[model samples]
Target: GSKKQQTESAENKEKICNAAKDNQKACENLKEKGCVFNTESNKCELKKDVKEKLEKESKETEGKDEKANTTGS
Candidate 1:
């Protein structure tokens, strides 16, 4: 009885791990192309929004740097 229980448990663990691997595999295909995983969609999304945000942040930082330099002694 214990042996059977242990076998079933091992099989369940294998199934769980396999499913996790498959899910990651799906995302890996998109990640290679500058996409990110979207938990809400359970899929990879193009990183356009991410890129835009970074660009905006970079511009803001550059503007701040210029202002700081102008005000420096």
Candidate 2:
């Protein structure tokens, strides 16, 4: 029983580590593409162009995420 739980925990740890590594790589790649890294936020926030697109999408999708939840089924 202990061994089985240990194996599962190890698998989850590996998954999380791999995912973080992938994220770091992506952030680095974005930095190379004119993105800026915010040390305080600990993320490679996109440039003005990408930020504008994100804002546009946020406006376009406004109420989209809330629509499904609005129906109290």
Candidate 3:
């Protein structure tokens, strides 16, 4: 895909976000959530963690997950 034969750096990020959608909005649509990586996906949510990590921009989902923190609005 470049002048090189291997590139795990950006490739790894694409592994999570996917190249199927647009750079931003389409990523927001297809990316994020714990199982949003699988379950073949749905419009499951506006994530505060997995999805938020995307929205939060350059933040880290590598810290930990917050699945059980589902509290009140």
lDDT of each: 0.49, 0.48, 0.41
lDDT of candidate 1 over 1-73, digit per residue (tens): 1323325433443344334443756555545444555567564544555445644666655655432557557
Q: Per-residue lDDT tens digits of candidate 2, residues 1-73?
A: 1323325433443344333343656656555444555456565554445544544666665664533637666
Evaluated with TM-score, which candidate comes out highest? 1
lDDT of 3: 0.41
Q: Model 3, residue 67: displacement in angstroms?
A: 48
TM for every model, in the order presented, reads: 0.30, 0.27, 0.21
Local accuracy of candidate 3 as per-residue lDDT tens digits, 10-73: 3454454544432445555655422233223532222335434444565354543346534558
Candidate no. 3 TM-score? 0.21
lDDT over C-alpha atoms for residue 68 of model 2:
67
Q: Give the distance in Å from residue 9's predicted Cα in candidate 1 to where it truly belongs.
A: 48
Q: Model 1, poorest ten-residue lDDT window? A: 1-10
Q: How many Å off is the CA of 68 in candidate 2?
A: 51
Give the TM-score (vs. native) of candidate 2: 0.27
RMSD in order of candidates:
18.3, 12.3, 15.4
| Best first by lDDT, ranked | 1, 2, 3
